[PDB]
Write a protein that holds these residues in place. Structure first.
Motif, mmCIF file in Angstrom:
data_model
loop_
_atom_site.group_PDB
_atom_site.id
_atom_site.type_symbol
_atom_site.label_atom_id
_atom_site.label_comp_id
_atom_site.label_asym_id
_atom_site.label_seq_id
_atom_site.Cartn_x
_atom_site.Cartn_y
_atom_site.Cartn_z
ATOM 1 N N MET A 1 56.161 -5.495 0.486
ATOM 2 C CA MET A 1 55.216 -6.578 0.405
ATOM 3 C C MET A 1 54.103 -6.364 1.440
ATOM 4 S SD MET A 1 56.790 -10.078 -0.929
ATOM 5 C CE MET A 1 57.776 -10.787 0.352
ATOM 6 N N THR B 1 60.078 -18.918 2.091
ATOM 7 C CA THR B 1 60.756 -17.947 1.207
ATOM 8 C C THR B 1 61.429 -16.815 2.035
ATOM 9 O OG1 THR B 1 59.382 -18.425 -0.717
ATOM 10 C CG2 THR B 1 60.481 -16.339 -0.702
ATOM 11 N N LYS C 1 62.029 -4.196 -9.486
ATOM 12 C CA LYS C 1 60.904 -3.380 -9.952
ATOM 13 C C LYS C 1 61.412 -2.006 -10.147
ATOM 14 C CE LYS C 1 56.785 -5.058 -7.509
ATOM 15 N NZ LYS C 1 55.913 -5.459 -8.636
ATOM 16 N N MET D 1 57.962 -7.353 -12.584
ATOM 17 C CA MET D 1 59.382 -7.242 -12.252
ATOM 18 C C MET D 1 60.192 -7.854 -13.351
ATOM 19 S SD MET D 1 59.729 -10.285 -9.485
ATOM 20 C CE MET D 1 58.401 -9.899 -8.346
ATOM 21 N N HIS E 1 58.396 -15.933 4.622
ATOM 22 C CA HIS E 1 56.990 -16.341 4.537
ATOM 23 C C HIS E 1 56.750 -17.775 4.057
ATOM 24 C CE1 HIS E 1 57.386 -14.581 0.404
ATOM 25 N NE2 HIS E 1 56.540 -15.541 0.075
HETATM 26 O O1 LIG Z 1 58.952 -9.084 -4.733
HETATM 27 C C1 LIG Z 1 57.738 -9.167 -5.069
HETATM 28 O O2 LIG Z 1 57.116 -8.234 -5.632
HETATM 29 C C2 LIG Z 1 56.983 -10.464 -4.845
HETATM 30 C C3 LIG Z 1 57.813 -11.576 -4.213
HETATM 31 C C4 LIG Z 1 57.043 -12.887 -4.061
HETATM 32 O O3 LIG Z 1 55.892 -13.049 -4.506
HETATM 33 C C5 LIG Z 1 57.774 -13.969 -3.380
HETATM 34 O O4 LIG Z 1 59.004 -13.837 -3.167
HETATM 35 O O5 LIG Z 1 57.159 -14.989 -2.999
#
Ligand SMILES: O=C(O)CCC(=O)C(=O)O
Ligand SMILES: COC(=O)[C@@H]1c2cc3c(c(O)c2[C@@H](O[C@H]2C[C@H](O)[C@@H](O)[C@H](C)O2)C[C@]1(C)O)C(=O)c1c(O)cc2c(c1C3=O)O[C@H]1C[C@H](N(C)C)[C@H](O)[C@]2(C)O1
Ligand SMILES: [Fe+3]
Length: 256
Positions: free
Chosen positions: A145, A130, A100, A56, A191
């Motif tokens: 995700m 998060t 992305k 990304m 998460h």
């Molecule tokens: O947006 C993603 O591809 C990954 C995001 C991630 O790993 C996070 O926010 O902890």
């Protein structure tokens, strides 16, 4: 609704992630989207990637330069949900604007499974949370995700050199079921820092636009990871921060 909120937290504790639909309304989606795009088009962004391709592009600590992103980071709904899920008062550590997309020479690739916790340079990293907010529709093919439910309960991975490493290294772990969570614009996931997660490549011709905000315990203190680019926190003064220094004030604002 209290019962609903308790059910949401129950899910959080069991699985280590939760999907909350419609946390922003349509006008908020358009506001935060507009700004996300402005920042990616005009501010400096960081590439996370490799010879394999771009995972990304992202705007680091987007809340320090944008009052709009700061309001998204401390949004009252998101903030009330975060604190109820974490079970104690919180501060914002950072928000990033995430992109992305496929470019001519540079196809989007997946976000590999990882364990964020100890890549966060603060004392309470193991219990951080998060909020990932969709600003466009993110079906599976656009790079939504995947989470491993219950993985937040496993013993931490063996301490490698990479503080985000060790997904699918614990005994039995590869046998755990995995949950892919497409999201509509204005949905978020929360998460746990120990929850193993991944994301697909964006295989469509429309960019994947979102924000990811990390929240920490209100009493957290600085803890270096050892990785320069994670440890070097902008807008925290002239001198490097010292281990055990409190992360307080407007730089690390109380959610409440
Ligand atoms: O947006 C993603 O591809 C990954 C995001 C991630 O790993 C996070 O926010 O902890
Ligand atoms: C030494 O690692 C590297 O130089 C690359 C790299 C980098 C990261 C990460 C990396 O895995 C890698 C590296 O990881 C793998 C990626 C590939 O599977 C493989 O091509 C390669 C040999 O090793 C590649 C590279 C060029 O060395 C992360 O995993 C990473 C992360 O999991 C979490 C973050 C990471 C990273 C990485 O930066 O950085 C920030 C920004 C993130 N935001 C945008 C969600 C996160 O907040 C967070 C905590 O902090
Ligand atoms: Fe992550």
């Amino acid at each position: 609704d209290p019962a609903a909120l308790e059910r949401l937290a129950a899910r959080y504790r069991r699985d280590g992630y939760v999907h909350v639909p419609g946390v922003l309304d349509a006008g908020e989606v358009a506001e935060y989207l507009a700004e996300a795009r402005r920042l990616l088009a005009h501010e400096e962004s960081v590439r996370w990637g490799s010879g394999a391709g771009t995972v990304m592009d992202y705007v680091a600590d987007a809340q320090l330069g944008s009052d709009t992103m700061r309001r998204l980071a401390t949004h009252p709904r998101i903030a009330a949900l975060a604190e109820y899920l974490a079970g104690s008062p919180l501060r914002l550590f950072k928000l990033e604007v995430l992109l992305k997309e496929n470019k001519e020479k540079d196809a989007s690739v997946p976000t590999a499974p990882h364990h964020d916790a100890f890549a966060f340079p603060f004392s309470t990293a193991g219990t951080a949370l998060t909020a990932w907010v969709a600003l466009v529709d993110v079906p599976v093919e656009r790079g939504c995700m995947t989470f491993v439910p219950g993985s937040h309960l496993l013993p931490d991975p063996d301490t490698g050199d990479e503080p985000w490493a060790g997904a699918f290294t614990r005994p039995g772990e590869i046998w755990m079921p995995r949950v892919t969570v497409p999201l509509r614009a204005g949905d978020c996931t929360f998460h746990h820092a120990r929850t193993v997660h991944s994301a697909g490549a964006n295989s469509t011709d429309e960019p994947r636009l979102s924000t990811s905000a990390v929240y920490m315990d209100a009493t957290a203190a600085y803890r270096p990871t050892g990785i320069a680019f994670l440890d070097d926190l902008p807008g925290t003064g002239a001198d490097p921060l010292r281990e055990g220094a409190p992360l307080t004030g407007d730089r690390f604002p109380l959610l409440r």
